[PDB]
Amino acid sequence: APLTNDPTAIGPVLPFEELHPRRYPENTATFLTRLRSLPSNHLPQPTLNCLLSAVSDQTKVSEEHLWESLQTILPDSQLSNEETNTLGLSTEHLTALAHLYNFQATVYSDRGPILFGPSDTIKRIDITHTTGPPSHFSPGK
Amino acid sequence: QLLPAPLTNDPTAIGPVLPFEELHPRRYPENTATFLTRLRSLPSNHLPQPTLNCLLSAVSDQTKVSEEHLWESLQTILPDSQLSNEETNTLGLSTEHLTALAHLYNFQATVYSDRGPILFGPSDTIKRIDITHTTGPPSHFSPGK
Amino acid sequence: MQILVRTPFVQFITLEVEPSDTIENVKAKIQEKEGIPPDQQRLIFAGKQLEDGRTLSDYNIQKESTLHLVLRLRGX
Amino acid sequence: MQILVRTPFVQFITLEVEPSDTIENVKAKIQEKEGIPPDQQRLIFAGKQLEDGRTLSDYNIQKESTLHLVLRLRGX
């Protein structure tokens, strides 16, 4: 994996919920990651930015500040890679954003609602997901 | 209620009234362990087994742990005011006791109630049990789906 | 063999309420929509358990807000 | 006004599988049953995220064992 040799990461590979313990929905934060080593490298915004746009619409937080906050918590190898440039951001980034900004997100997918983000929070947002193809995130329900 | 009144002056409890998930942090299903309680202070008083003990019987069948050991384990974690009170004598044990038992023995219980399945107990566990609940009345706990 | 798979999908219930409705009334409306007795109902909003004698306005529950339901079954 | 209530009920899907079936085969069974693409499927048993190139026997998944499905949506 690229994050095993990521210069901007330090420490062993651990699940996200172990590195940043919150009241996550079960197995939604078990994805492998590493602790950020260097500060933000100020990566350019992903071209496929509809996940950030949907979160920005709901939380009234600018997409630049959302993306900068991700660069403080995740290594660069999990922020700009082959999936990010071709498909866009994932609900794993939503979980990281949810931890950063203390909200729980409800994602109304084509097959039913799902939850991402710590439950020990007050702010609640709604995201709509379509399989497509290609998949798209939109605010609201 | 949301706060058993005898708990506030229970001689077997110390500390403030906090939700179960704050005094015993685990990966509980959301808000299933938010019920208020206090930390047990005194050792077990060896309270008699409740007359309505289907919950202990249901857990005993699934986990192969005698109801006596299950009941003693509860007396180490919960104060007496939440183990033998008015509701215990007339209605029996609650799923909140099941959450405490799940924490003590590291299992997650799936409760097949009359309106759908419901989960209790920490998710960072391996042992899985199935318990059936019937509203009735009277309410009953039974092992299995 | 045969195995069981737990999906992560969430079920929602829609209720017609007024700002002055008591929490007891809210639980009574859930019984009429799902069949859950009010005794075994526990409603949580903004991380705090809702008391029966309070109203939706007391907790500042605006329109389109979501409440979390937790079952407390006894019996066994 | 109008409010939503999130119920605590969970949904289970029954699958008939063989001990030698691979994880990818298990995912394709959930696609035929529920309509979820294998791309956005993440199966967890015993707290460890299961790998696509492994079989159910590799994870010691017996009969009547319960697996948890987690959706990883992208897009835008």
Residue numbers in the entry:
A (entry chain C): 734 to 874
B (entry chain A): 730 to 874
C (entry chain B), D (entry chain D): 1 to 76
Paper text:
We explored this idea using the model virus Turnip Yellow Mosaic Virus (TYMV), which encodes a vDUB known as PRO that suppresses Ub-dependent antiviral responses and is vital to virus replication as a protease that processes the viral polyprotein. The tightest binding UbV (UbV3) was chosen for further study and was found to block both polyprotein cleavage and DUB activity of PRO in vitro. X-ray structures of UbV3 in isolation and bound to PRO reveal that the inhibitor exists as a dimer that binds two copies of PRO. UbV3 blocked polyprotein cleavage activity that is essential for TYMV replication, and also, DUB activity that usurps cellular Ub-dependent antiviral mechanisms.
After several failed attempts to crystallize the complex, we ultimately succeeded by covalently linking UbV3 to PRO by modifying the C-terminal glycines of UbV3 with 3-bromopropylamine as we have done previously to generate stable complexes of vDUBs bound to Ub. As verified below, the modification yielded covalent linkages between the C-termini of the monomers within UbV3 to the active site cysteines (C783) of bound copies of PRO, which enabled crystallization of the complex for structural analysis. The X-ray crystal structure of the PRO-UbV complex clearly revealed two copies of PRO bound to one UbV3 dimer. The C-terminal tail of each UbV3 monomer lies within the active site cleft of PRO, where the C-terminal propylamine is covalently linked to the sidechain of C783 of PRO as expected, and the interactions between the C-terminal tail of UbV3 (71LRLRG75) and PRO are consistent with how Ub binds the protease. Furthermore, the sidechains of L71 and L73 of UbV3 pack against a hydrophobic surface of PRO comprised of V840, I847, F849 and F870. The sidechain of UbV3 R6 forms a salt-bridge with the sidechain of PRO E759, whose active site binds to another UbV3 chain. As a result, the total binding interface between TYMV PRO and Ub is ~884 Å2 according to PISA, whereas the interface between PRO and UbV3 dimer is expanded to ~1318 Å2 (~961 Å2 for a UbV3, which interacts via C-terminal tail, ~356 Å2 for another UbV3 which interacts via β1-β2 loop). Thus, the dimeric structure of UbV3 expands the hydrophobic binding interface with PRO compared with Ub, and this likely underlies its high affinity and selectivity for the protease. The X-ray crystal structure of the covalently linked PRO-UbV3 complex agrees with the SAXS ab initio envelope model of the non-covalent complex, and this suggests that the binding conformation is not disturbed by the introduction of a covalent bond that was needed to crystallize the complex.
